[PDB]
PDB file of all heavy atoms in Angstrom:
ATOM      1  N   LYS T  14     -20.378 -21.617  17.314  1.00  0.00           N
ATOM      2  CA  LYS T  14     -21.817 -21.587  17.055  1.00  0.00           C
ATOM      3  C   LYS T  14     -22.174 -20.502  16.034  1.00  0.00           C
ATOM      4  O   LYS T  14     -22.792 -19.489  16.350  1.00  0.00           O
ATOM      5  CB  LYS T  14     -22.597 -21.398  18.355  1.00  0.00           C
ATOM      6  CG  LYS T  14     -22.613 -22.615  19.248  1.00  0.00           C
ATOM      7  CD  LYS T  14     -23.994 -22.854  19.817  1.00  0.00           C
ATOM      8  CE  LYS T  14     -23.961 -23.889  20.920  1.00  0.00           C
ATOM      9  NZ  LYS T  14     -23.066 -23.477  22.028  1.00  0.00           N
TER      10      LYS T  14
ATOM     11  N   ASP S  11     -12.932 -13.142  20.692  1.00  0.00           N
ATOM     12  CA  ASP S  11     -13.792 -14.233  21.127  1.00  0.00           C
ATOM     13  C   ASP S  11     -15.216 -13.935  20.692  1.00  0.00           C
ATOM     14  O   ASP S  11     -15.849 -13.023  21.223  1.00  0.00           O
ATOM     15  CB  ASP S  11     -13.713 -14.413  22.636  1.00  0.00           C
ATOM     16  CG  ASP S  11     -12.316 -14.729  23.101  1.00  0.00           C
ATOM     17  OD1 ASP S  11     -11.436 -13.853  22.986  1.00  0.00           O
ATOM     18  OD2 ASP S  11     -12.093 -15.857  23.576  1.00  0.00           O
ATOM     19  N   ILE S  12     -15.720 -14.718  19.751  1.00  0.00           N
ATOM     20  CA  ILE S  12     -16.981 -14.449  19.082  1.00  0.00           C
ATOM     21  C   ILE S  12     -17.873 -15.658  19.303  1.00  0.00           C
ATOM     22  O   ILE S  12     -17.423 -16.798  19.144  1.00  0.00           O
ATOM     23  CB  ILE S  12     -16.773 -14.178  17.591  1.00  0.00           C
ATOM     24  CG1 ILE S  12     -15.608 -13.216  17.403  1.00  0.00           C
ATOM     25  CG2 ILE S  12     -18.002 -13.578  16.996  1.00  0.00           C
ATOM     26  CD1 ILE S  12     -15.305 -12.920  15.977  1.00  0.00           C
ATOM     27  N   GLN S  13     -19.120 -15.427  19.683  1.00  0.00           N
ATOM     28  CA  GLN S  13     -20.025 -16.507  20.031  1.00  0.00           C
ATOM     29  C   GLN S  13     -21.439 -16.207  19.558  1.00  0.00           C
ATOM     30  O   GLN S  13     -21.895 -15.066  19.638  1.00  0.00           O
ATOM     31  CB  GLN S  13     -20.008 -16.732  21.535  1.00  0.00           C
ATOM     32  CG  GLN S  13     -21.088 -17.651  22.034  1.00  0.00           C
ATOM     33  CD  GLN S  13     -20.978 -17.904  23.514  1.00  0.00           C
ATOM     34  OE1 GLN S  13     -19.936 -17.670  24.115  1.00  0.00           O
ATOM     35  NE2 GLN S  13     -22.058 -18.385  24.114  1.00  0.00           N
ATOM     36  N   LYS S  14     -22.132 -17.235  19.066  1.00  0.00           N
ATOM     37  CA  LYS S  14     -23.561 -17.168  18.758  1.00  0.00           C
ATOM     38  C   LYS S  14     -23.854 -16.068  17.732  1.00  0.00           C
ATOM     39  O   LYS S  14     -24.457 -15.041  18.033  1.00  0.00           O
ATOM     40  CB  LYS S  14     -24.381 -16.966  20.032  1.00  0.00           C
ATOM     41  CG  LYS S  14     -24.457 -18.185  20.916  1.00  0.00           C
ATOM     42  CD  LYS S  14     -25.863 -18.391  21.436  1.00  0.00           C
ATOM     43  CE  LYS S  14     -25.895 -19.433  22.533  1.00  0.00           C
ATOM     44  NZ  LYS S  14     -25.029 -19.050  23.674  1.00  0.00           N
ATOM     45  N   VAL S  15     -23.410 -16.315  16.503  1.00  0.00           N
ATOM     46  CA  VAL S  15     -23.327 -15.270  15.491  1.00  0.00           C
ATOM     47  C   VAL S  15     -24.337 -15.547  14.386  1.00  0.00           C
ATOM     48  O   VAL S  15     -24.052 -15.352  13.201  1.00  0.00           O
ATOM     49  CB  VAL S  15     -21.895 -15.169  14.949  1.00  0.00           C
ATOM     50  CG1 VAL S  15     -21.708 -13.935  14.097  1.00  0.00           C
ATOM     51  CG2 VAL S  15     -20.935 -15.168  16.092  1.00  0.00           C
ATOM     52  N   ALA S  16     -25.506 -16.058  14.762  1.00  0.00           N
ATOM     53  CA  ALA S  16     -26.563 -16.334  13.798  1.00  0.00           C
ATOM     54  C   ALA S  16     -26.809 -15.142  12.881  1.00  0.00           C
ATOM     55  O   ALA S  16     -27.028 -14.028  13.351  1.00  0.00           O
ATOM     56  CB  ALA S  16     -27.854 -16.697  14.528  1.00  0.00           C
ATOM     57  N   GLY S  17     -26.762 -15.367  11.583  1.00  0.00           N
ATOM     58  CA  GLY S  17     -27.052 -14.316  10.632  1.00  0.00           C
ATOM     59  C   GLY S  17     -26.112 -14.391   9.441  1.00  0.00           C
ATOM     60  O   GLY S  17     -25.431 -15.389   9.243  1.00  0.00           O
ATOM     61  N   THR S  18     -26.093 -13.317   8.643  1.00  0.00           N
ATOM     62  CA  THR S  18     -25.250 -13.257   7.418  1.00  0.00           C
ATOM     63  C   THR S  18     -23.907 -12.587   7.727  1.00  0.00           C
ATOM     64  O   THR S  18     -23.579 -11.598   7.044  1.00  0.00           O
ATOM     65  CB  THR S  18     -25.976 -12.508   6.293  1.00  0.00           C
ATOM     66  OG1 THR S  18     -27.215 -13.172   6.044  1.00  0.00           O
ATOM     67  CG2 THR S  18     -25.164 -12.431   5.018  1.00  0.00           C
ATOM     68  N   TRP S  19     -23.162 -13.111   8.704  1.00  0.00           N
ATOM     69  CA  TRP S  19     -21.835 -12.537   9.057  1.00  0.00           C
ATOM     70  C   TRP S  19     -20.959 -12.500   7.801  1.00  0.00           C
ATOM     71  O   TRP S  19     -20.553 -13.580   7.335  1.00  0.00           O
ATOM     72  CB  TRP S  19     -21.182 -13.345  10.183  1.00  0.00           C
ATOM     73  CG  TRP S  19     -19.803 -12.880  10.539  1.00  0.00           C
ATOM     74  CD1 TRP S  19     -19.211 -11.704  10.182  1.00  0.00           C
ATOM     75  CD2 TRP S  19     -18.834 -13.588  11.331  1.00  0.00           C
ATOM     76  NE1 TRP S  19     -17.946 -11.630  10.697  1.00  0.00           N
ATOM     77  CE2 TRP S  19     -17.686 -12.771  11.406  1.00  0.00           C
ATOM     78  CE3 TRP S  19     -18.822 -14.826  11.983  1.00  0.00           C
ATOM     79  CZ2 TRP S  19     -16.544 -13.157  12.105  1.00  0.00           C
ATOM     80  CZ3 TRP S  19     -17.694 -15.206  12.672  1.00  0.00           C
ATOM     81  CH2 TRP S  19     -16.571 -14.380  12.732  1.00  0.00           C
TER      82      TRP S  19
ATOM     83  N   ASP J  11     -14.615  -8.955  22.763  1.00  0.00           N
ATOM     84  CA  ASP J  11     -15.518 -10.024  23.162  1.00  0.00           C
ATOM     85  C   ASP J  11     -16.918  -9.689  22.678  1.00  0.00           C
ATOM     86  O   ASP J  11     -17.546  -8.762  23.192  1.00  0.00           O
ATOM     87  CB  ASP J  11     -15.497 -10.214  24.672  1.00  0.00           C
ATOM     88  CG  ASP J  11     -14.126 -10.568  25.183  1.00  0.00           C
ATOM     89  OD1 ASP J  11     -13.220  -9.714  25.104  1.00  0.00           O
ATOM     90  OD2 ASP J  11     -13.949 -11.703  25.660  1.00  0.00           O
ATOM     91  N   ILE J  12     -17.408 -10.453  21.716  1.00  0.00           N
ATOM     92  CA  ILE J  12     -18.637 -10.149  21.005  1.00  0.00           C
ATOM     93  C   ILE J  12     -19.566 -11.335  21.188  1.00  0.00           C
ATOM     94  O   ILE J  12     -19.142 -12.487  21.038  1.00  0.00           O
ATOM     95  CB  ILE J  12     -18.371  -9.877  19.524  1.00  0.00           C
ATOM     96  CG1 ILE J  12     -17.174  -8.945  19.381  1.00  0.00           C
ATOM     97  CG2 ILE J  12     -19.561  -9.242  18.888  1.00  0.00           C
ATOM     98  CD1 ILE J  12     -16.814  -8.649  17.969  1.00  0.00           C
ATOM     99  N   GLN J  13     -20.821 -11.074  21.526  1.00  0.00           N
ATOM    100  CA  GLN J  13     -21.764 -12.132  21.835  1.00  0.00           C
ATOM    101  C   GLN J  13     -23.153 -11.793  21.315  1.00  0.00           C
ATOM    102  O   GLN J  13     -23.583 -10.642  21.385  1.00  0.00           O
ATOM    103  CB  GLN J  13     -21.807 -12.365  23.337  1.00  0.00           C
ATOM    104  CG  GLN J  13     -22.926 -13.257  23.794  1.00  0.00           C
ATOM    105  CD  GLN J  13     -22.875 -13.520  25.275  1.00  0.00           C
ATOM    106  OE1 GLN J  13     -21.850 -13.316  25.914  1.00  0.00           O
ATOM    107  NE2 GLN J  13     -23.987 -13.975  25.833  1.00  0.00           N
ATOM    108  N   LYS J  14     -23.854 -12.801  20.793  1.00  0.00           N
ATOM    109  CA  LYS J  14     -25.269 -12.695  20.435  1.00  0.00           C
ATOM    110  C   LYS J  14     -25.498 -11.583  19.405  1.00  0.00           C
ATOM    111  O   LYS J  14     -26.084 -10.543  19.691  1.00  0.00           O
ATOM    112  CB  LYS J  14     -26.127 -12.477  21.682  1.00  0.00           C
ATOM    113  CG  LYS J  14     -26.267 -13.699  22.555  1.00  0.00           C
ATOM    114  CD  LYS J  14     -27.695 -13.871  23.025  1.00  0.00           C
ATOM    115  CE  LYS J  14     -27.793 -14.916  24.113  1.00  0.00           C
ATOM    116  NZ  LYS J  14     -26.958 -14.561  25.286  1.00  0.00           N
ATOM    117  N   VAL J  15     -25.017 -11.837  18.192  1.00  0.00           N
ATOM    118  CA  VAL J  15     -24.872 -10.789  17.189  1.00  0.00           C
ATOM    119  C   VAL J  15     -25.849 -11.035  16.048  1.00  0.00           C
ATOM    120  O   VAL J  15     -25.518 -10.843  14.875  1.00  0.00           O
ATOM    121  CB  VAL J  15     -23.420 -10.723  16.698  1.00  0.00           C
ATOM    122  CG1 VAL J  15     -23.172  -9.489  15.860  1.00  0.00           C
ATOM    123  CG2 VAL J  15     -22.500 -10.752  17.874  1.00  0.00           C
ATOM    124  N   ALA J  16     -27.044 -11.517  16.380  1.00  0.00           N
ATOM    125  CA  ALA J  16     -28.073 -11.762  15.378  1.00  0.00           C
ATOM    126  C   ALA J  16     -28.255 -10.559  14.458  1.00  0.00           C
ATOM    127  O   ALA J  16     -28.462  -9.442  14.927  1.00  0.00           O
ATOM    128  CB  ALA J  16     -29.397 -12.094  16.060  1.00  0.00           C
ATOM    129  N   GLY J  17     -28.169 -10.780  13.163  1.00  0.00           N
ATOM    130  CA  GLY J  17     -28.399  -9.716  12.208  1.00  0.00           C
ATOM    131  C   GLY J  17     -27.419  -9.810  11.049  1.00  0.00           C
ATOM    132  O   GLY J  17     -26.757 -10.825  10.870  1.00  0.00           O
ATOM    133  N   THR J  18     -27.345  -8.735  10.259  1.00  0.00           N
ATOM    134  CA  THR J  18     -26.458  -8.691   9.064  1.00  0.00           C
ATOM    135  C   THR J  18     -25.109  -8.057   9.424  1.00  0.00           C
ATOM    136  O   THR J  18     -24.732  -7.074   8.759  1.00  0.00           O
ATOM    137  CB  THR J  18     -27.124  -7.918   7.919  1.00  0.00           C
ATOM    138  OG1 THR J  18     -28.369  -8.548   7.623  1.00  0.00           O
ATOM    139  CG2 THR J  18     -26.266  -7.856   6.673  1.00  0.00           C
ATOM    140  N   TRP J  19     -24.413  -8.604  10.423  1.00  0.00           N
ATOM    141  CA  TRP J  19     -23.085  -8.067  10.826  1.00  0.00           C
ATOM    142  C   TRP J  19     -22.164  -8.046   9.602  1.00  0.00           C
ATOM    143  O   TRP J  19     -21.770  -9.135   9.145  1.00  0.00           O
ATOM    144  CB  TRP J  19     -22.493  -8.897  11.970  1.00  0.00           C
ATOM    145  CG  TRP J  19     -21.116  -8.469  12.376  1.00  0.00           C
ATOM    146  CD1 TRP J  19     -20.482  -7.307  12.047  1.00  0.00           C
ATOM    147  CD2 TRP J  19     -20.194  -9.205  13.199  1.00  0.00           C
ATOM    148  NE1 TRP J  19     -19.234  -7.267  12.606  1.00  0.00           N
ATOM    149  CE2 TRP J  19     -19.029  -8.418  13.318  1.00  0.00           C
ATOM    150  CE3 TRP J  19     -20.237 -10.446  13.845  1.00  0.00           C
ATOM    151  CZ2 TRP J  19     -17.923  -8.837  14.055  1.00  0.00           C
ATOM    152  CZ3 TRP J  19     -19.143 -10.858  14.570  1.00  0.00           C
ATOM    153  CH2 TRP J  19     -18.002 -10.062  14.675  1.00  0.00           C
ATOM    154  N   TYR J  20     -21.830  -6.854   9.099  1.00  0.00           N
ATOM    155  CA  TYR J  20     -20.962  -6.739   7.898  1.00  0.00           C
ATOM    156  C   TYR J  20     -19.506  -7.064   8.254  1.00  0.00           C
ATOM    157  O   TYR J  20     -19.013  -8.123   7.823  1.00  0.00           O
ATOM    158  CB  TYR J  20     -21.130  -5.371   7.233  1.00  0.00           C
ATOM    159  CG  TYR J  20     -22.282  -5.299   6.266  1.00  0.00           C
ATOM    160  CD1 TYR J  20     -23.140  -6.373   6.101  1.00  0.00           C
ATOM    161  CD2 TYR J  20     -22.522  -4.160   5.514  1.00  0.00           C
ATOM    162  CE1 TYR J  20     -24.204  -6.321   5.216  1.00  0.00           C
ATOM    163  CE2 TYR J  20     -23.580  -4.092   4.624  1.00  0.00           C
ATOM    164  CZ  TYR J  20     -24.425  -5.176   4.473  1.00  0.00           C
ATOM    165  OH  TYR J  20     -25.471  -5.119   3.599  1.00  0.00           O
ATOM    166  N   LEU J  22     -15.815  -5.735  11.098  1.00  0.00           N
ATOM    167  CA  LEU J  22     -15.322  -4.996  12.290  1.00  0.00           C
ATOM    168  C   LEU J  22     -14.524  -3.777  11.813  1.00  0.00           C
ATOM    169  O   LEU J  22     -14.918  -2.644  12.148  1.00  0.00           O
ATOM    170  CB  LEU J  22     -14.445  -5.930  13.128  1.00  0.00           C
ATOM    171  CG  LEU J  22     -15.191  -6.824  14.117  1.00  0.00           C
ATOM    172  CD1 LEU J  22     -16.065  -7.831  13.384  1.00  0.00           C
ATOM    173  CD2 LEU J  22     -14.219  -7.537  15.041  1.00  0.00           C
TER     174      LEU J  22
END
Side-chain angles (χ1 to χ4, degrees):
Chain T
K14 287 223 191 59
Chain S
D11 300 67
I12 314 178
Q13 169 177 342
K14 287 223 191 59
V15 191
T18 302
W19 176 14
Chain J
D11 300 67
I12 314 179
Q13 169 177 342
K14 287 223 191 59
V15 191
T18 302
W19 176 14
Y20 275 4
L22 275 66

